[PDB]
């Protein structure tokens with residue numbers, strides 16, 4: 001397997017459980033602080049022990065100054081946001097939260113909780129990662145048990161993690177379940193803009209699953225799509241496509257980001273990181289620059305990739 005060792009530049013530090021790197025439509029950069037994430041890493045099992053409410057930070061990319069935008073809590077229950085995407089129609093962030101479900105967060109710091117329950121009427125589970133398709137439907141992973149006020153649990157040892165689609169008609173549809181800690185998630189699109197495949201990381205099992213997408217909340221042909229190397233504690237966390245539809249995957253605990261070609265299988269290349277625990281990654285729009293969050297130093301870095309990123313939904317035109 002070829003390996004590259006590109007230069008990484010540190011942008012900021014001292015952000016517990018650093019995750020959800022995202023750019024909005026104005027090109028502003030946000031990251032998520034997650035005390036619960038950091039705690040789950042330091043614990044020896046059931047420990048997670050009341051944690052503080054994680055918040056969303058604006059990070060100035062020239063100066064490194066952090067500004068707290070929002071510290072979500074609902075009804076005394078601190079949120080644990082973990083993954084972010086920017087909307088297309090309007091400038092707002094959709095934030096998967098392991099305690100509160102799906103949030104929509106404004107730049108001025110107000111936020112709405114989107115779903116107490118799903119469309120079949122079952123309680124909502126805590127959400128971690130999300131990806132918009134080009135239709136505006138949000139696919140979401142849910143590795144946690146029920147949202148607050150249920151006790152916090154995560155499917156890291158047992159199969160109860162679920163997948164949702166929040167559709168453009170505002171329905172939260174459970175589309176699959178019994179995952180062991182579903183993590184990063186992505187939508188492979190055809191060159192003509194059609195959504196084609198849903199890729200979901202199952203973290204501790206060192207597997208990437210795929211489904212064929214036939215429409216809003218309509219998936220089939222569930223298959224193991226990619227093998228993640230290594231026997232370390234961890235496995236695939238965040239993931240993003242490049243313009244050529246190669247899938248880059250943070251392999252938490254391995255010191256590498258894995259690169260898969262469009263047909264999956266085994267990684268075609270690995271990216272060696274100067275740290276063991278890459279967690280999440282996102283491209284700077286219209287650039288080759290990848291921002292990566294990391295749990296050795298609770299830091300955010302950047303490196304230049306060989307090509308530009310795939311457009312997110314937020315970068316596409318209403319026309």
Ligand SMILES: CN(C)C(=O)[C@H]1CCC=C[C@H]1NC(=O)OCc1ccc(C(=O)NCCOP(=O)(O)O)cc1
Nearest residue numbers: 037040041043044045128143156233234237252279
């Ligand atoms: C930390 N991380 C990269 C995540 O993506 C979070 C966020 C939400 C979704 C998945 C989470 N994954 C995670 O926390 O993985 C790290 C991890 C934490 C605990 C464990 C665990 O099973 N036990 C902790 C003690 O294990 P040992 O020390 O005995 O090996 C394994 C991996």
